[PDB]
From a paper:
The spike (S) protein has two distinct subunits, S1 and S2, and the receptor binding domain (RBD) in the S1 subunit interacts with the host cell receptor. After binding to ACE2 via the RBD, a protease on the host cell surface cleaves and activates the S protein, allowing the virus membrane to fuse with the host cell membrane. Here, using the S1 domain of SARS-CoV-2 S protein as an antigen, we screened an extensive DNA library and found a standalone VHH that is specific for SARS-CoV-2. This new VHH (termed K-874A) bound SARS-CoV-2 S protein with higher affinity than previous VHHs and does not require any modification with antibody fragments, making them a very attractive therapeutic candidate.
To estimate the K-874A binding region on the S protein, we reconstructed the cryo-electron microscopy (cryo-EM) structures of the recombinant S protein trimer and its complex with K-874A complex, and fitted each molecular model to the maps.
Author numbering: 27 to 1140
């Protein structure tokens, strides 16, 4: 009975307070949807190998998730440890049902906690016995009592069956216990749903747990009615087991601050979107996510085919050394070092290691080493460091300003002593000959140069820098002789040659695996190197340290370190409300390795992803799984690349079909760009429209976003004194950036008023509305709303999150508090601000309305200058003249033009209202600032390598002097991140103001006059255009012409009448097939071919195209 751990195992990792935040992190987690070993009964061979024991001892394996159910209190406690005996320490963790008792005692092995053994009474056994499992308590170490973990007490309130889901962990010796209780109804299968597990007690027990079991106390059974021997264990408590693995997650809360749901950050390519995006709902499109890797484990990986220890003790058990001046160097090479037995034994007085941190010594492969043997005076040892100076340092031995291995110093009065003392060591005295690191000078400085202004010619007597060291064994301490060696490692100058005493193991290929080549501890898949290497080349960093290929130091063969098969992972999903399945794409990677792996591929189970027989597909964009190609091409919604798209809205597959799955199948195809049609080229004929279908489109444009700002400081500084002290010593940085905030913010308002204040004066609707049958109702404002806010823009407002997803009312705030007047944004907590527009919506609107009124009633003139009356009839007529249509057509066809107009308006509102997110760019900016702002928010929480992210604590619990560096590093980082944030807003400021200029143009040209530019203001011959604001934006109605209902017409540019080539003044000569007439290109107005509607010039004969006809002259 193995069963998916459907969603069970998730807990509370730490007790840091938080509310409704998608924080991703990683720990030892039982896999979800994962097999859990049921352990139920005594069923045959479940009791063999034991003493009729039902639920065997099990491997700990780094973590256990534990769960039991019952009708009534049955399941007793557990026992943990290495071996569960008195030989090795044990853990006895028992629920007395009166109290939970936890003991790390060394109790004798219990084959059964319930064995038929007892010695106080009649010899059989039973619960008559007083906890017979309590074998003996010798060398007990820990004892603890707490409240029971009662199992039925959960189920008592609701009269149901229950479970208790458990996670036992031992991290850093701390044995953390996380808990939960819940009712069930099904006992056959693991329930679907969700729950969280919270820490009960941490126990710093510090025993390597590897074996564990569950304990039960057998009373009896009633399966067969014979005797007390019918005390069958069959029908005893069952349970599940799984183990915990280091995989990443995501975790969520509710209003009450409690976990209600989670999305896994190590489960599924689909799930990884909801992880990385930090959403529980992913939208339609293509989304790229983070790659994966396998467990961190490996042996001593690959040290050279060299294996022989170095003779270190010679340096160390040596009785003949030199003085501090006579600092010798000794060569270490071509052997295996050890720094365990070196480090471990108790001989060294000084051991301190520089630029090198002393643990992994025995896994360090070195190129070469330098043993600096000499004897020092006891107090001088502190001066053995870079940054020291002194007679020994400045005049016996110096240090470079780069890495030197170690310092080893130790008293030598057991070998440097003669009862008469030791004058037998020496050092140089100062003589102003200051030198550089590592001069083995032994020159006798008896006479100087002489011309030096500090020596030679300066007042000397019998002085000799060679100063002997006079030891005495009866002299005391401080000046006792201290033999000292300077360890200095060269690394990376060559193949490393001397390694620590750690034998490496074999190597694997093509699997994502770490490794360590002579200290080169790297990772990836191992691909055979196709390079003719060069034999004095060990590792090839093809560019900028990228040690691309490696030659192993045991087999001497070359290996391209391909970083384990590397290629982007992106998803193809229709959304979340749509469905919960995904296509798996890898970027320019042929699916030849694992197609896709969460830590490994799998053949039959839920990871079923095959490069053949599964939903494999191959492109220049790399191989696809999930995606089955199909031949038919259509348009693209979720892109992939090269037109290859995985988006069919309506599939022929019924069951799943979501938008990218097709009955459990992601589909594959390419953008079809539209239909296919030859238009019949001829050299002599047109089709000129005999009707039209004008259209009005929706040109949607954001005009602004929030003029936020920040108290840079109180953002950062949170109003702290020493905070501000260190803050200022950086300085105007804050000032710089928020000055930018200023310029850009005021800038956007200038942009807005700019896109609005094009006119001197303000117009109102004329009360009578007899405007040629063109209804303006819905576009126009109505007094019923505050300040005559137009129907259309009201819909705009409602269609958008005026609240902007409520940045006054997301995860709420201080409720009803200083949060001021209920519509803008921005969740102000501290440091930050936003300032409401200089132009509130109301003016913004009534501008636009004045715009409208002018362009209707006075047309060209209201913004150009004085607004002058004109019938919008003949105004529209002149605008047809602007698109080149005579006022004849409008005159004749005024009513249907009106009707199309107003119907178009209605369709406009139909769209904008019905179509959600029609406004993309608007709410785009909204979202943009949303994240920018909110990120900025989160960035307070970045500890930045400090010991705490909050300024408060880092200042508080620290004395200032040390607090200086942490405070600083934080100042640096958060400051920096702000400055970044600033920069990004700047990015917008730019692209915004660009769009803003664009839109100001859009209005000015297409509205104060008539756009005559191609697709500037919408497809077609523009007539008029109209302003439709958004709280940070504007949309535009556009009156453009589209002809229709065409018919063939053979043509002739000239009419060859009366020996003279006659041509049409305005248009082209047209025929029905038999009658030659004149009409222009955008409509059939066949005309009697007159000299009035034509003209004569040149000759008719020389060039093709003409016909012969007659022409009528006035």
């Amino acid at each position: 009975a193995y069963t998916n751990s459907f969603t069970r195992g998730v807990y509370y990792p730490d007790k840091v307070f938080r509310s409704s935040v998608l924080h991703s992190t990683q720990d030892l987690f039982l896999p979800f949807f994962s097999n859990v070993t049921w352990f139920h009964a005594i069923h045959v061979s479940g009791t063999n190998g034991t003493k009729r024991f039902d639920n065997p001892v099990l491997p700990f394996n780094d973590g256990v998730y534990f769960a039991s159910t019952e009708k009534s209190n049955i399941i007793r406690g557990w026992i943990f440890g290495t071996t569960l005996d008195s030989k090795t320490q044990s853990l006895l963790i028992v629920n007395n049902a009166t109290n939970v008792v936890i003991k790390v005692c060394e109790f004798q092995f219990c084959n059964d906690p319930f064995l038929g053994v007892y010695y106080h009474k009649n010899n059989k056994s039973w619960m008559e016995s007083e906890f017979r499992v309590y074998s003996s308590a010798n060398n007990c170490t820990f004892e603890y009592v707490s409240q029971p973990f009662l199992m039925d007490l959960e189920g008592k309130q609701g009269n149901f069956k229950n479970l208790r889901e458990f996670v036992f962990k031992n991290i850093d010796g701390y044995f953390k216990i996380y808990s939960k209780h819940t009712p069930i109804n099904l006992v056959r299968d693991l329930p679907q749903g969700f729950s969280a597990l919270e820490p009960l007690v941490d126990l710093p027990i510090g025993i390597n747990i590897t074996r564990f079991q569950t304990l039960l106390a057998l009373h009896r059974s009633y399966l067969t009615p014979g005797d007390s021997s019918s005390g069958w264990t069959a029908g005893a408590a069952a349970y599940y087991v799984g183990y915990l693995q280091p995989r990443t997650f995501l975790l969520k809360y509710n209003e009450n601050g409690t976990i209600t749901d989670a999305v896994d950050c190590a489960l599924d390519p689909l799930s990884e979107t909801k992880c990385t995006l930090k959403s529980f709902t992913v939208e339609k499109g293509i989304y790229q996510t983070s790659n994966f890797r396998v467990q961190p484990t490996e042996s001593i990986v690959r040290f050279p085919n060299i294996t022989n220890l170095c003779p270190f003790g010679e340096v160390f058990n040596a009785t003949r050394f030199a003085s501090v001046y006579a600092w010798n160097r000794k060569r270490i090479s071509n052997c295996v070092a050890d720094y365990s037995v070196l480090y471990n034994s108790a001989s060294f007085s000084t051991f301190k290691c520089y630029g090198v941190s002393p643990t992994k010594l025995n896994d360090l492969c070195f190129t070469n080493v330098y043993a600096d043997s000499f004897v020092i005076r006891g107090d001088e040892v502190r001066q053995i460091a870079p940054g020291q100076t002194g007679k020994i340092a400045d005049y016996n031995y110096k240090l470079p300003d780069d890495f030197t291995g170690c310092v080893i110093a130790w008293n030598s009065n057991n070998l440097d002593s003669k009862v008469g003392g030791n004058y037998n060591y020496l050092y140089r005295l100062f003589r102003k000959s200051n030198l550089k690191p590592f001069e083995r000078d032994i020159s006798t400085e008896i006479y100087q140069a002489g011309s030096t202004p500090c020596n030679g010619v300066e007042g000397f007597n019998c002085y000799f820098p060679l100063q002997s060291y006079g030891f005495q064994p009866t002299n005391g301490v401080g000046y006792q002789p201290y033999r000292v060696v300077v360890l200095s490692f060269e690394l990376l100058h060559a193949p490393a040659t001397v390694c620590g005493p750690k034998k490496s193991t074999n190597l694997v290929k093509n699997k994502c695996v770490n490794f360590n080549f002579n200290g080169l501890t790297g990772t990836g898949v191992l691909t055979e190197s196709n390079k003719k290497f060069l034999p004095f080349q060990q590792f090839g960093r093809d560019i900028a340290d990228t040690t691309d290929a490696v030659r192993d130091p045991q087999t001497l063969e070359i290996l391209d370190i391909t970083p384990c098969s590397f290629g982007g992972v992106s998803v193809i999903t229709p959304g979340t409300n749509t469905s919960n399945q995904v296509a798996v794409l890898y970027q320019d990677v042929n699916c030849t390795e694992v197609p896709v792996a969460i830590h490994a591929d799998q053949l039959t189970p839920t990871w079923r992803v095959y490069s053949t027989g599964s939903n494999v597909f191959q492109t220049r964009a790399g191989c696809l799984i999930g995606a089955e190609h199909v031949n038919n091409s259509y348009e693209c919604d979720i892109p992939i690349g090269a037109g290859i798209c995985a988006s069919y809205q309506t599939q022929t597959n019924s069951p799943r079909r979501a938008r990218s799955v097709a009955s459990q199948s992601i589909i594959a195809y390419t953008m079809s760009l539209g239909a296919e049609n030859s238009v019949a080229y001829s050299n002599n004929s047109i089709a000129i429209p005999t009707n039209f279908t004008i259209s009005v489109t929706t040109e949607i444009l954001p005009v602004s976003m929030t003029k936020t700002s920040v108290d840079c400081t109180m953002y950062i500084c949170g109003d702290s004194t020493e905070c501000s002290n260190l803050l200022l010593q950086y300085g105007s940085f804050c000032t710089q950036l928020n000055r930018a905030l200023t310029g850009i913010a005021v800038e956007q308002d200038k942009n807005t008023q700019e896109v609005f204040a094009q006119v001197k004066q303000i117009y109102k609707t004329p009360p009578i509305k007899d405007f040629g049958g063109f209804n303006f109702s819905q576009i126009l404002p109505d007094p019923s709303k505050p300040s005559k806010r137009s129907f259309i823009e009201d819909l705009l407002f409602n269609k958008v999150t005026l609240a902007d997803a409520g940045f006054i009312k997301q995860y709420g705030d201080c409720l009803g508090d200083i949060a001021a007047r209920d519509l803008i944004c921005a969740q102000k907590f501290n440091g930050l601000t936003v300032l409401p527009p200089l132009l509130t919506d109301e003016m913004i609107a009534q501008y636009t309305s004045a715009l409208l009124a002018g362009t209707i009633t006075s047309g060209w003139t209201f913004g150009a200058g004085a607004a002058l009356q004109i019938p919008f009839a003949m105004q529209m007529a002149y605008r047809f003249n602007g698109i080149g249509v005579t006022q004849n057509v409008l005159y004749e066809n005024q009513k249907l033009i009106a009707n199309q107009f107003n119907s178009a308006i209605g369709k406009i509102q139909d769209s904008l209202s019905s179509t959600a997110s029609a406004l993309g760019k608007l709410q785009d900016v909204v979202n943009q600032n949303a994240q920018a702002l909110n990120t900025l928010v989160k960035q307070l929480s970045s500890n930045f390598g400090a010991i705490s992210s909050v300024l408060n604590d880092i200042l508080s619990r620290l004395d200032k002097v040390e607090a200086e560096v942490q405070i600083d590093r934080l100042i640096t980082g958060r400051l920096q991140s702000l400055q970044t944030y600033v920069t990004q807003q700047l990015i917008r400021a730019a692209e915004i103001r660009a769009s803003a200029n664009l839109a100001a143009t859009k209005m000015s040209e297409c509205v104060l006059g008539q756009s005559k530019r191609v697709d500037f203001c919408g497809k077609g011959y523009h007539l008029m255009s109209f302003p439709q604001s958004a709280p940070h934006g504007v949309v535009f109605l556009h009156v453009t012409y589209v002809p229709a209902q065409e018919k063939n017409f053979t043509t002739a540019p000239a009419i060859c009448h009366d020996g003279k080539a006659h041509f049409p003044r305005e248009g082209v000569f047209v025929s029905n097939g038999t009658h030659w007439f004149v009409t222009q290109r955008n409509f059939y107005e066949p005309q009697i071919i007159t000299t009035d509607n034509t003209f004569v010039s040149g000759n008719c004969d020389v060039v093709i195209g003409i016909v012969n006809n007659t022409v009528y002259d006035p």
